[PDB]
Amino acid sequence: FMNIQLISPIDAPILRQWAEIIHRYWPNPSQIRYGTPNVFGSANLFTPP
Amino acid sequence: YPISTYNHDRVNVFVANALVGAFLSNQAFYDLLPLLIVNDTMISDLLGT
Amino acid sequence: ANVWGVRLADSLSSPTIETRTRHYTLHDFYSDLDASVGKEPWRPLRNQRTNEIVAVQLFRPLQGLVFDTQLYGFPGTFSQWEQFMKEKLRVLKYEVLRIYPISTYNHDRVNVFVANALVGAFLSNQAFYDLLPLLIVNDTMISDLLGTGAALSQFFQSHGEVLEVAAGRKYLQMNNYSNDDDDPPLFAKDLSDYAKAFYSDTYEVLDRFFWTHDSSAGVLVHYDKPTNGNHYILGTLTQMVSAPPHIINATDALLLESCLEQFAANVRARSAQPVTRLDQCYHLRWGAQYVGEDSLTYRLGVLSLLATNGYQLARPIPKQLTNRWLSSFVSQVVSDGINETPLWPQERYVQIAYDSPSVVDGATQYGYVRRNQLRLGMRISALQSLSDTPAPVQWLPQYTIDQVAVDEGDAMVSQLTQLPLRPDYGSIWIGEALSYYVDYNRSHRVVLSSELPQLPDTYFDGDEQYGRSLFSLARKVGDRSLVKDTAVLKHAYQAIDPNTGKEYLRAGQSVAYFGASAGHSGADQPLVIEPWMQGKISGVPPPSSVRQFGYDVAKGAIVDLARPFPSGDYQFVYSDVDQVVDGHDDLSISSGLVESLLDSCVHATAPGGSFVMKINFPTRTVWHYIEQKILPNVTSYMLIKPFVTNNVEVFFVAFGVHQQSALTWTSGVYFFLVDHFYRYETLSAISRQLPSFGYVDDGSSVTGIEIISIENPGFSNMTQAARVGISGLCANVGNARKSIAIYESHGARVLTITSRRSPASARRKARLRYLPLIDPRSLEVQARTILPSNPVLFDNINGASPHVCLTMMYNFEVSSAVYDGDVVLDLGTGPEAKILELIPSTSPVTCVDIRPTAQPNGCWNVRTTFLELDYLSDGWITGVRGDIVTCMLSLGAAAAGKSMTFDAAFQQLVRVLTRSTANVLLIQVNCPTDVIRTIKGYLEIDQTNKRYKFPKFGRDEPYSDMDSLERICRAAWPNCSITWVPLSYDLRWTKLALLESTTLSSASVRIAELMYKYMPIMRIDIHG
């Protein structure tokens, strides 16, 4: 699953296609701003505040 | 297989003998035809197929 | 290039004259309706491999056979079939003649549709009487069928100014048709219905009719000269099955058949015989919205347009079509590849190019457009197919001015070889055994036994046994013992005694035989006994009785020949007992066993007689023992050598036993032994460099065979890579004989090139700098089918000619004379210079002969200079720089060409060579060395006019003696050191003839030596 080329399309075509669909069209995580850090502070530990 | 592009590559002996034996016995020989041209050694295609 | 299968470029042709049509009258219908023996309306088709009638092609009166085969019920055999057809058509003839009087209806045209439908209805018994009023036509052929009122929908029906009619059965299938691979294809024209041809008068009305009508399978037009008026043909959805790997449908088969028929007609156009129709191609008209690109209907529409324009196929088609050929053609056309021709299939009209040779536009008012836009660059000519050969033929190269690197050609030939294969070996040495003899003389010399040579110490090693076993396995004979015995007896019965005057051995001798063996694939005895007893040798007298002893007798007795045994006393005794079986592989026990055999054979000799002893391993102890013991008790002797297998064994023959005398060894015997041992050493050194008997070749061997096999599709200028590969093979071969073969292999036209390499070839490959390239024209012209054979290593089975052997002798003399790093020059090489394989790689050359050469200019490491200025003339040698000049087999030719004497020609040569800067020189001269024997059939002299008269070549040359040659040489230079090199009895020259893979001879090498003694080579050093 982590390397696609170990699945031959001769032996498992639709399963190789499903691996392609996962590795190309899985949703990308993004990031958004909230709050007021400048006077509220922020309790964000690992992320930037 | 076209002969003019597959003239000078070595063929697979196990797939050749099993292909002749399956064609003489009428035992669904079509899934052997992709394994007829060999790559990376003779034995690892039959292992990792 | 090509579309998908290769079409023949560089030419295009088409027929020109078209026959004027002929109206089909009632008298013609009657003459076709009865079947004369000269002509009948059916032609039989036949199988290719069995010559059996399996199908019948039909013609004009019977073409309305649209019903099923069960409705007719024909017999299966062709003779009964045609007899049934003759009888039933005669019944129909009587019916139609009873209806219509011939005398009033002689010269009116009859109706073709009614004729075909009438025959088809009468053969099917389907109420044919309502067709008989429609048989005589009026006002046109088509309007009677339109405006008629007789209701018969089995054959035709009208839709209003558009008549449809079900055509059928161009071909007819017999019972023995079994879809075999040599059966003729029928193109789905034997079914009930393959198409429905719609007839009318105007194509606008036809196109208005096909608005509401479907066009699923696609329609086909004809546009040239249709069968019965302007019409379209719509094929149905039936299939053709008599083509194995793929199934095509009806209109596909019609378009394929007419495209192949037009491809047939384009080749056979001769510009004076007329054809019945200029093009038979269809050019599909409406179905192109349903059949699209890369489909078989589209691709055959493309090929149909190309056939109409007048292209030709790259490979020839048969006279009778086969299912294998049709399968191969369609399998070629469904492949990958773009349309390379500018001709694209249109839809509005069939288009023809500007310079297409077809004249169909002049004989047709509607359909064709001379497009001035697109042009075709290829020239106009017909096809010229050369006639094929079953055997591979020889090829010779011609070079060009371009050049590449050597390693590129080496990589390309390594890509193109099929070299890991097992060639057939052949035979090194053929013929009867050569015979080398010497006899005792009283007045030569007395020498001691310690001075004579012996075996080399490196004799029983692995490489030496390898060389001897290779030579013994490759040398082809009949019976070894028979040939040896004939040689030793013919050289034994020549001896004369010094006591009396006649000879030693006579008839009625009562001989004994030692060392008898049983198995010889004949009688259970050695094969010399009964012909020598019957006198069939005819150089011998027959003995009185022969008794045979040894370990392996069949008609004698088994004894141990070492120590004595009860027997009689025999007046002559021939012994072969050898020291391999009883000797335990060591020279001491072998020599002691030789001494014991000599003791037994001397004590069993019945004094006043003779004996013959073989010796495998002649060593110093053996020579010392025989000199101490045997020679004082022997009157005279000789020791001879039959040469069949490479070993050091000799024969000892002694005459006149048990008389007290004094005999020793002589200097002639010493010379014979030195020659014998050096001959063994040279031939063993040659045999240790050859490959083994049944080897496979990998390329690492210094001599062997190599092939390449590259493919050539049709007529095409070959690419850079093929030219580099073939030129690299030529540089690897080095002007040996090269044979090619062109043949279809697994659905591909491919050619092979087969030749051999040599150490002289490797020397020539070390000579040059850049790899030159050949002219590929001599291979591009070839359109044959040259069937190959299995490769052999020794191709020459008849052996080498004595001229070739003499040439190899002179070549070995040149290669031995020329040192390393020395400027040379040659007189008269020829178109190719053989001296390039002789001189070393660092030595520069400058050959000169009148004929223009063929070896390439430029691309050498060292200086090579080619020039043609008649070297015998004067005024050229001043600028020429050389150290040694060589004239081989050309001075006599120049003397015969100038029609002048040999002395004057040699004097002119030495006058022009005085101006040079050379100091050593050797040239071939025509001089009698020994007394003349005037060799029968190879060199018959003229004693009066002094000519040579070579009968094999038809040439004659003047000569003179060594006295005159030495006179002119000493008149030229006072300090010249004249010498005459002797011939090679030791066969030291055989290196160049065996390493270049040539089976020599026996009789021709004897004739070559006896020819060399009458025209030797002299060497001149002008100093010293």
Ligand SMILES: C[S@@+](CC[C@H](N)C(=O)[O-])C[C@H]1O[C@@H](n2cnc3c(N)ncnc32)[C@H](O)[C@@H]1O
């Ligand atoms: C002399 S050679 C070969 C002779 C050859 N077959 C011929 O027919 O002329 C070896 C043969 O000599 C025979 N022979 C008889 N007496 C022998 C002995 N004392 N030592 C060696 N070989 C002897 C062996 O049987 C053996 O077949």
Ligand SMILES: C[S@@+](CC[C@H](N)C(=O)[O-])C[C@H]1O[C@@H](n2cnc3c(N)ncnc32)[C@H](O)[C@@H]1O
């Ligand atoms: C090919 S040779 C034969 C000898 C050759 N070296 C060999 O070993 O076979 C014969 C050639 O010698 C050339 N030749 C003979 N006399 C000549 C002359 N006076 N001047 C120039 N060339 C001559 C001829 O042109 C002819 O092609």
